[PDB]
Amino acid sequence: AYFQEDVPISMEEHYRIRHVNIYYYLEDDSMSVIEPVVENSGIPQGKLIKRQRFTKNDMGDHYHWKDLNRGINLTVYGKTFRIVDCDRFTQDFLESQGIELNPSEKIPLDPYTQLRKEPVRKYVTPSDFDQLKQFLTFDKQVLRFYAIWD
Amino acid sequence: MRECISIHVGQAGVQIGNACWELYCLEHGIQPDGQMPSDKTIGGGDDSFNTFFSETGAGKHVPRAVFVDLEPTVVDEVRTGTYRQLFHPEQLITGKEDAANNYARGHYTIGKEIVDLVLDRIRKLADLCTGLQGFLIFHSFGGGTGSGFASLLMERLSVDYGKKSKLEFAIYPAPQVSTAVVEPYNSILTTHTTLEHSDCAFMVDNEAIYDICRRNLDIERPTYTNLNRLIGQIVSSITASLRFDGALNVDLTEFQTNLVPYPRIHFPLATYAPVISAEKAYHEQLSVAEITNACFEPANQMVKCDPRHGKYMACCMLYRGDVVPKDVNAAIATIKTKRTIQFVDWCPTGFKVGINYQPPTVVPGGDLAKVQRAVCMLSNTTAIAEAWARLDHKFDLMYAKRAFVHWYVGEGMEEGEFSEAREDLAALEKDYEEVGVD
Amino acid sequence: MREIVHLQAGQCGNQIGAKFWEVISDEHGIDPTGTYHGDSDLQLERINVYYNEATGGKYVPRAVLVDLEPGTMDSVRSGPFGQIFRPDNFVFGQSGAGNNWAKGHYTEGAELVDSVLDVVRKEAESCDCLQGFQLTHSLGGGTGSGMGTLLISKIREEYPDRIMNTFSVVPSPKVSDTVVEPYNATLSVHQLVENTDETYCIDNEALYDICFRTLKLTTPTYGDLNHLVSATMSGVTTCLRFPGQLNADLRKLAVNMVPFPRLHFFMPGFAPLTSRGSQQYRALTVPELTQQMFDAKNMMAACDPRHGRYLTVAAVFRGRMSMKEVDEQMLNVQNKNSSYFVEWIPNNVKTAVCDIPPRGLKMSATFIGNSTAIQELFKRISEQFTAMFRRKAFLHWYTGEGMDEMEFTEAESNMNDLVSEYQQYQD
Amino acid sequence: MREIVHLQAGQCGNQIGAKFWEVISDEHGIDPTGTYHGDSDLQLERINVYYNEATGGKYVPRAVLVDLEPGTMDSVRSGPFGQIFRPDNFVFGQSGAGNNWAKGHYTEGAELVDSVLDVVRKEAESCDCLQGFQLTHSLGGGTGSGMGTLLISKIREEYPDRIMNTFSVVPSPKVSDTVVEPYNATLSVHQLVENTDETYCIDNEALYDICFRTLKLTTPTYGDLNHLVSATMSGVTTCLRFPGQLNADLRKLAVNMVPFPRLHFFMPGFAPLTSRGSQQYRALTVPELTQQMFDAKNMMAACDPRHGRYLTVAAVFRGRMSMKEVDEQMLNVQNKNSSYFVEWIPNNVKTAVCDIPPRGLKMSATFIGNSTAIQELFKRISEQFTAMFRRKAFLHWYTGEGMDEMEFTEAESNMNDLVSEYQQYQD
């Protein structure tokens, strides 16, 4: 999953975008949000939401896996997220149930993160030097055209 | 621009020269043809390669190296080998008779009639050359051919072109192992004849290489191919700064300024930290703290000098690969805080740092690993005089019994130089002790 | 009109100048190719201060880069803004320095000094009226020190009438890299202090303190280091080039900030540094900018003047603010900590209020302070130099170069005089 | 405008800090992300007592968390309302404490106290003017006590003009789990009584009793325990942020409730508890409200007051009440049982009436009163200390860290003094 945020004061960006991992357990239907850790990130990584169950609507309902699918958004204690895609045992089990899977989608990348490092591109062009090959290969080789001018 | 001249004297050192040029061809993709694949960069000779190879308009990177020897065996073999077209023909200079380990034989009886040719070749390099920062001579003290001839040629170059640098690596005599009992004689002769003409001398030993090989390379049956690959990697490290681009760079000028404190004394020691195998580097981890502790680990040094026996003057560290100076200087600070290491008061600062971003290189069919951070250690300290003491307390006995001096007088020399060399040494040890005196 | 010619020397300069220029280009809106994009009237209108006019919406930097090893020139030209400089504004020798200051100071310079003087007078007469010159280098940087000493010595008599800003960096108290750094420092200072008027001090270890306090990004780059210090010099230069009812001239700063012929060394300082989440976890108010600017951690120049006292301070705030917050803040600090000031001068603060901030943020500032802080620095250099001179180690190269020990002796005498004077005036 | 700065320490006191802050946030209607949901103009008016503002509608709390164990702060940070705290506001050490006292009192505090003082002085300068501070910790907690002793010691002198609310929890009479626990408490209580003004006295055994009295749900969570304590603490704070014909200041309560410099121990009291039938089976009338207030079971601090005698009592009322009914309630209760008050001061009752209902019900109250009660508590802990000091079991760690028995001796002298003093005021 991922989520967006807006920076009010910093020099670089309107916005930052962050990736996260969601683990839904099968034991007590707890869920946990974990951010992967990347160096020089300038954010406190680690654990973001400890072990507990989660509240969909006011009454006290609980996000039973019977309602989750690909391509779904959901608001959770304020901050809202969007689901991109899943992994092997996840879709196998979920189709064993028979939840109709939705077409996948690209996970975006942080422009701040890329501009931190570099443009990943190509190089190499010098000036123009291949005379030896022509000279040796084509020793005294000439052409003979008969042309007419009016 | 920035380029040197490679000198490889002695069928002692020609195999290691062969190995090092073989290693050099990989990272630039020099094929044993001598020409590049499709991607064109050949031109006015302006890119990294030009520091080592003089590609003329031929498309053939020809090295600025010269091999000189008095045995035709190995040189004929190599010109029958693979890189024979790579090498230029008569910069492979050959003779027919060897010095038979005799320093004087290698210095006088034969030295007259080949210096002329090598002079011609070195000048015909130097003319087209423009940078001429210095020379990388590779020789041997116990030279069955190399020793005396090398001393004479470095004498003549010192007297003719005195405005550039001179660097020397050498295999050192094995302190408790011998290959020819001529070794104390030829060693002392070379040393004292060269002391007033040698800028910087670095020392390597086969026993230490071997011990490393079965301690961390963990292969009990090594080869010269292994020895030569390791030392070639060392020299590749020491020249990477000149070769490529980097955040900050250092040069032989800076080396000859900072490392040596005084006149005379110019004998530091080399070390390479991440000397380890592929599987180790694979499922272990590499980083600056542990490699830094390793560089001061006392058992990886290629000279059998006990650190706590001596004390330190200079430390030049070349960090090659991916690093930032923060943890680097933090680690060197932690080492300064460490108590066992004993800096003299002469050097409250002694840390010449050089950072080159470009990671090092593996070789196909090799035994090294896919390093990211390497650190090469060039340190000058007092713990080496033990070697000189070991040499002299045997030189004296062999002098007293005067065996093989009949050989030397028969080949036409005397005892006066042998006499004076010993107090030359004694002066060297006394100066070591005086500088150790705080 | 009044303008400035920039000078960059030494390998440190070879990167710092690049970073500083690219930041200024970002500010005034010049694309790397060099074709102006009109978005700010003021940036369009106060540009002749540094940029001269080329053809077709393009502009030349009035900066001069010097070095000896063409590899640095290769790197600078290959950089993101190397194309914006001129080949003519590059000049190099054909040898290495190896930071033997004597080599650079009697042998390596004598053959490029003439050419660099020709180029600099070319640019000066190209301009109309200068405020002066600023030169960026290291006092421990051998090539920079050796070149800059002679350069300033010549420009002093050639133009005895302009502002002589020197922006040089300081060796690390914990590790100096180069062992001869004490020697280089002495050979620099002994003439720098008598040729210059204003000297800045900047410390890498303090930068790393900054990283471990507010950057909190583990592994930084010297590029980011250059980013910060370039921002500092940009801030000190902004006042001249923007509208607003404030005083600008570096002379109007120096007359306030310079009591004595021997008082030259200053302590920069920057304003709000955002932490990882402070971007949207902070509140941008004049009081808290003031509190942050006058904080020990924010310091980056030399070492804590908590030991010492303060003589003068000049603060330049930037953005739409009001006279009253700055006035009351200065009175507040004056009455709050009224002991660590010096009774000699009353009201040691000098205010400047620029209207237009840097692009993106609302209110910012920068600091400079003359206070007793460099004392332990040159005390350490004194002890290093005495320990080295005690046994002439490494000195034979200079003997061969044609140097004599009397020079070292008068240099150490001069630095002892500065130590004694700085201690004496307030203690 | 007058504000309060809040301190959070000790692994429990941290529990309580989280729960208390989230309770206040929910009352004032704030999302987990800090964006206000407009419902109550009055609450928006008075938010400024606790919450600063960060640009973009973000009300950064004026609280500080301090501890030494990284994982605890990871947990509180990753709680559903942990994001509202600041990365700036997280000072901590890289070590454990061992649930020692002298360790956190000498060995490790000395290198954290500096940072906490710097941050607290920053925020103190940021805010305008203070009634005082409030601390959440554990008297029995190792790290919490080891910090708080030194903290209050440090703040007393330079801030001798404000009110230092102290909030902690007594270990159970039957069991303390931790065994060095009375050693720690007998160390701390000395400095606590030395530096104290106001102290809330709580133990969780009575709280388990209350749960089995009226919630009847067998198994709660310490989270629910902290829900209850959070409500009890909120009780006092309700006054400032709401209008009404009452007096709000902690001094307004404290000078009244404190007859002599040696009275700082106060017992909570709460409003009608709810059972699953009570939501529609209660009879919400001030008669039974006050009956419950002085219901022996309603008491939740330590133990039965009917052994002792009351000294002062104060009731804060929350809702649209009238004063005559509570006044005649006080009349009637005096008539019925005047016996267990004292002749020292008649009319021991004070009534403050805040008029904004709580979130969930219309009218409620919080009771805070001090009586001749804590005798058996500290008497019990005193036999504990006599037994343990009979041969000085476990002393060797404390001696190795550096301590001496004489300090224990004057401390126990102090507690015996408190025994005698309270016994006499009763007698």
Ligand SMILES: Nc1nc2c(ncn2[C@@H]2O[C@H](COP(=O)(O)OP(=O)(O)OP(=O)(O)O)[C@@H](O)[C@H]2O)c(=O)[nH]1
């Ligand atoms: N340089 C070098 N030394 C080796 C090698 N293998 C053993 N050695 C040591 O190096 C010394 C070689 O020196 P010399 O015997 O004088 O060599 P030389 O003068 O060229 O004459 P040759 O022995 O015939 O090669 C020996 O004593 C060995 O201790 C090797 O491959 N290269």
Ligand SMILES: Nc1nc2c(ncn2[C@@H]2O[C@H](COP(=O)(O)OP(=O)(O)OP(=O)(O)O)[C@@H](O)[C@H]2O)c(=O)[nH]1
């Ligand atoms: N640009 C740059 N300079 C650095 C950096 N770290 C240290 N420096 C210092 O900047 C100084 C100035 O460099 P130069 O004046 O160009 O070098 P120099 O005159 O040849 O003398 P040296 O100090 O021996 O290099 C160097 O001495 C370094 O000590 C860095 O990361 N980037």
Ligand SMILES: Nc1nc2c(ncn2[C@@H]2O[C@H](COP(=O)(O)OP(=O)(O)OP(=O)(O)O)[C@@H](O)[C@H]2O)c(=O)[nH]1
């Ligand atoms: N967070 C938390 N604390 C609890 C809980 N239950 C009891 N506590 C109390 O927390 C007390 C100690 O907390 P702290 O004040 O942080 O003490 P400390 O200085 O960190 O060192 P310790 O007392 O050894 O934990 C224990 O003595 C318990 O009485 C709980 O369920 N959660």
